[PDB]
Amino acid sequence: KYSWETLPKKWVKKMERSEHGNRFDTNTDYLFQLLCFLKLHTYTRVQVLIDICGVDYPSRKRRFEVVYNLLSTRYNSRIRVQTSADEV
Amino acid sequence: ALNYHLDSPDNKPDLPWEFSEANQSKVKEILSYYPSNYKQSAVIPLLDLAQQQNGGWLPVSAMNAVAKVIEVAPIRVYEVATFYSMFNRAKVGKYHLLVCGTTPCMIRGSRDIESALLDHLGVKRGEVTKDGLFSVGEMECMGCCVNAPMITVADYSNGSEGYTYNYFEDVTPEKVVEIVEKLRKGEKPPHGTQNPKRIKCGPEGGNKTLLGEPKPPQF
Amino acid sequence: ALRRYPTGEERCIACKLCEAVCPAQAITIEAEEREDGSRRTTRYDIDMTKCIYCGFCQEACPVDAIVEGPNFEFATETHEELLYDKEKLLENGDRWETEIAENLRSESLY
Amino acid sequence: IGKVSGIPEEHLSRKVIIYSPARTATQSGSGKLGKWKINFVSTLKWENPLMGWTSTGDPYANVGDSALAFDSEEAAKSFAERHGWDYKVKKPNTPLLKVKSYSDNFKWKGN
Amino acid sequence: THFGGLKDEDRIFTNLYGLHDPFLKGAMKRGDWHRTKDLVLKGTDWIVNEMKKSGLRGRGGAGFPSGLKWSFMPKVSDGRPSYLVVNADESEPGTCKDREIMRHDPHKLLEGCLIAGVGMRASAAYIYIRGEYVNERLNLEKARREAYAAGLLGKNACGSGYDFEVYIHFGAGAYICGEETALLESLEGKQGKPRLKPPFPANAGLYGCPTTVTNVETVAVSPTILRRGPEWFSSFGRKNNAGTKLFCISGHVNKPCTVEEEMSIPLKELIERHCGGVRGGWDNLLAIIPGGSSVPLIPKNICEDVLMDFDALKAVQSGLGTAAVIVMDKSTDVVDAIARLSYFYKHESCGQCTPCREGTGWLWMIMERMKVGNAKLEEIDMLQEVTKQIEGHTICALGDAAAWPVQGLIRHFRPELERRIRERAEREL
Amino acid sequence: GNHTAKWMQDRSKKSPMELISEVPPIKVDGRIVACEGDTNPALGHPIEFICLDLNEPAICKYCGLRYVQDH
Amino acid sequence: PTQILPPRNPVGGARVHFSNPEDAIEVFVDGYAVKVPKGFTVLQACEVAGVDIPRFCYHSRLSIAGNCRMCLVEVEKSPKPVASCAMPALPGMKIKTDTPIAKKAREGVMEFLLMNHPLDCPICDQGGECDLQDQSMAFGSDRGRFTEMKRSVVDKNLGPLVKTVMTRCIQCTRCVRFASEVAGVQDLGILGRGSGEEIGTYVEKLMTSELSGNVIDICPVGALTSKPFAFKARNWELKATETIDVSDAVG
Amino acid sequence: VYNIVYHGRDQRRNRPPIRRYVLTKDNVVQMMNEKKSFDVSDFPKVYLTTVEEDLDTRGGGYE
Ligand SMILES: Cc1cc2nc3c(=O)[nH]c(=O)nc-3n(C[C@H](O)[C@H](O)[C@H](O)COP(=O)(O)O)c2cc1C
Ligand code: SF4
Ligand code: SF4
Ligand code: SF4
Ligand code: SF4
Ligand code: SF4
Ligand code: FES
Ligand code: FES
Ligand SMILES: [Zn+2]
């Protein structure tokens, strides 16, 4: 995927998937910075925050997982940047 | 054939049953074959002895007595009595004509054997005749195969003494009805091949191989 | 409506599949081996108010014991009546059987 | 993280039991083991006198079993200690895989 | 070479047809018990070695190389008295070759019990007579009482220093009890339900004591194999398969007979020579079940030039079991015959394991439908798949023995099955 | 009955237990019956094969119908 | 390439009891080595590997049996699928539990079991908690080709505790082993042969033994069910608490 | 209908397992050095969609 080559490696910190919709499980600090990327970028133009799905994993240490969906009306693709932030 | 027990005045675990004399000795011998422990090994011969002694079928009292003689829980004796086919658990009359029914008999007219025997006797398949004498029972391969159609009688008249499990082989409908009438008349028909011109298990035109007088070959 | 077999005998053997499949958990089923020996539901109470009328119970029931009668006209003055009692008011499907049996005889092809 | 969680005060003095549900003895299958669950005792369930059905009053009636299942005693204890519950962890009793073989049924009783 | 011709001085089972006295004073004249004292004194390793050198293979369905089987028994006895169960019980459909050894020269069987016992370090032989062989086991108990009175068996093996006693067990009408791992149990007193193979009978079989189950024909040719030449024995049959099998030409032959004849014999040659011929001429043949009933069919187009030896009949997509050749001519309903075979395997299946216990009743139901034509043209592929679901999965080879007749019937006479099905279809509408 | 006295308070319409205990047992031929349901195998219960080896009638658990051997 | 393999801990946290740390046999369960003590059946050598092999009659407390072939894993160099319950793990043995031959063997057997089995699942007391239902819905085929007359069996009277519906029973022999061995009373039996196999006392004989109500938990099928718990509830309604008992002092 | 083999037809469980492998700094610096240039066709294609006036020409108003 083109988006992973250009993206600074540090921004896609923890995880990265390759099916059922691709995701960049990033870190909470680099999130809005990562959302700044993929938008206002010529080859990755999302512009459309479809959804922000809170997901709660009680057995994790970072309980929640704020799943930002993102559609790219230009390139017709959908990326799901995620995070992980506990209750506080 | 039920694989469980339905009480009856003839057959119930209340009735006292035990090996008669001239059979206690056979019990002792049969148990002598197998070791002191593992005497459970003698449940097939003891059950067959009880079946011969009680005129052809195994009452639950008989299985309980075999269990007492053999020292295992009666369930193990019940398990073996319902498993093996030769052990009749309901009365099969005095003779229980067993006509084989496997393919090497079926292709050689054994279905006709059984149908002729049945319509002559007048029982469905395994029901005992109103005379209490005869009963027909299908049995799988009886070993008598080259002797193409066969019928095994189980003479239960006397009991453990006149108990003859004769093989009437190479039979035909006429031969079968003749055997049944000669059996109801009391006498014992000659077993073996009911078809002369062949010796036992022979090629039907006189054997073609075993002709020379036997002798020690060159060792 | 809880259906019945043509020869009386409530069709509802208490498997509890409809109590399980129910999305709103309207059906409360308690089962007891009746004296005849065949299982039956001592309590079969559908709470119509807590019920979404999705027909999942009609699909889940193995013997077609619970079916939805085309009634749809049972507006009740009081809420307690709207909670359909254990196998007594759902047993009024015997009146609707003439139409329920027709609908089932015509839908069973699907 | 008990006070910020909005849970009422009277339900943070609750006494829970962090067990691991044993295998359902009826079915010999381990596909539901290793899922540690907090067990809010939640014993108070009367019978609503109008209809035959029951009627709990404790909010934590079902969530102990339903939808709140961790994957390790450490995560479950961390959870029940964040929220300030008095957890008593009940360890799971695990089976010994004792060595056994077929040829032991046909053992010889010497004589 | 060209096999088949066995001269009357080369037949091992003399007095097969019971023409001469079976017991002693009639067996010593036929060479039985001739010099077994020397053989026992020649040792156990020599007996096993000569049996392996003679290339004697299993006379029973397994077809295993005997001798090599006898070398499986433990050498040093660890307290468990090694037994020797003789598989007299057959119950295979078509097979009477055992019935002509239990009676009609049983002393060969008793001397073979003794010679194999000293061969495999045994301590007692349990001749598991088939239950229905009442007259046969009476003759055999007569011969056993004789060989006991003549000091042959019991507390001194034919005057030698070997303590060996033959006990005669008899089952009760169960083909399943005949299996090697089920003989041990049906003789242990329990039901005739096979045990799984990981405990092998040579390691923990009868009473947990080691043992090897041998068909009467293999144990009974053992004496004459040793007294005659192991080179003489192996001089018959093809290279691997060697010996003189005891055949049983069973059905639809104008002269059905069991006759001993050299292995690797052309099936057609055996039929045309000894038992006469296929009823109505060879061109009237429909199919042949060459082994017992545990073996697929032979559709008469690969039955002309097939040899009655283990290897060739295995290479013809079949098996030589007890060599109880069942012949079927164009007049029989071959699907009905195989339906009755599957009924047999449904009846005589001790039901211990699910693939056989259930799938055999299933095979019987499908065969009793296809013999009328009540099935669908794709069931003939279900039947193949059902049989292949039964085959490899059952505890004992009875699962095989029940999937093989139907598999062979399909593989060969699929035209006839399909014809019956289409004729049923056109009978409707 | 007593079980039927828990859900039915009418006590004038015959209790289903009696409605099924008053229907006669159905004669059959073999040793196994079908009882697919009323008549239509798709409007009755899952087919329940009943054994008739016993002498007394063997009820179908789902429908209450009773079958006897009729030899 | 720096993968993250799952932990692969035993099937139920099962403590593996080495008789000594020297005789640990090393077998390959799906290409993942596991060190099992000497004598472990292939099934236990897989339960050490976290692989849950579907078993109908193999109870760890009870004896080992082949009354059905639901396990049939394919070891490397055997001609036929070996029953995992009785095959002792040999050092170096390669067990493939999910190879197409193993899965086809499992589907085959779960079709035979559901072939003569009655459609009693709705009226079966153990409808939700059933090994047969949960192995058919997980390893057995989605469809059944058997459309004929299933065999049926009368219901034996086994007392006021164990309600018996032997038609459902699959004749895996687990109970007839439990009553002979653990309960030690020897009343149950596998009467008959073939499909006609019937489990229970040959004469009407209430299971006079205590400790013989556990045959219901032993039973992988509804057949043997608690008659007191006749039908009163379902496997899903019941909220379970891991309480103890106070009747007898064994606790 | 008469071929009920399932593991071939299976969809729920007949899938390749999740391969979650870790990347350490060495791997990604290797990949960044390997990516020499972003030549065209290493770029995501645009979903080109323009608007075009049409009154009833598709089929003639009859579908
Ligand atoms: C399906 C099956 C059929 C068998 N049939 C026979 C038989 O007809 N006669 C017999 O003696 N043993 C029979 N056996 C037992 C063994 O296969 C084998 O014949 C015997 O244990 C040893 O014979 P052998 O030493 O000649 O190989 C059968 C076993 C199986 C599994
Ligand atoms: S339609 Fe049936 S299953 Fe659905 S909520 Fe209503 S009662 Fe429950
Ligand atoms: S209505 Fe249907 S699902 Fe509900 S208990 Fe009755 S039979 Fe079972
Ligand atoms: S079911 Fe078949 S394979 Fe299994 S023990 Fe019985 S006869 Fe042998
Ligand atoms: S045991 Fe009962 S619930 Fe399980 S499959 Fe059999 S009938 Fe259905
Ligand atoms: S009754 Fe239950 S435990 Fe006993 S054999 Fe049948 S299914 Fe197995
Ligand atoms: S045909 Fe097998 S014994 Fe008569
Ligand atoms: S349980 Fe292991 S194969 Fe039957
Ligand atoms: Zn019914």
Residue numbers in the entry:
A (entry chain F): 8 to 95
B (entry chain B): 31 to 249
C (entry chain D): 112 to 221
D (entry chain O): 39 to 149
E (entry chain A): 53 to 481
F (entry chain P): 38 to 108
G (entry chain C): 50 to 300
H (entry chain S): 67 to 129
The authors write:
The plant mitochondrial complex I has the classical open L-shape formed by the matrix and membrane arms. It holds an overlapping position with the NDUFA10/42-kDa subunit found in mammalian complex I5.
During 3D classification, two classes of complex I lacking the most distal proton pumping components of the membrane domain—Nad4 and Nad5 and their associated additional protein subunits—were found to naturally accumulate in our sample. One of the two classes presented an additional globular density on the intermembrane space exposed side of complex I. Such density wasn’t observed in full complex I classes. Using focused classification and refinement, we were able to derive an intermediate-resolution reconstruction on the additional density corresponding to GLDH which was sufficient to attribute the density to the protein. In this assembly intermediate, GLDH interacts with B14.5b—that is slightly displaced compared to the mature complex—and the 15 kDa subunit. Thus, it appears that GLDH prevents the binding of P1 to the PP module, until its release, which will then allow association with the PD module. Hence, in plants, GLDH might act as a stabilization factor of complex I assembly intermediates that would be released just before the final step of PD module docking to complex I*.
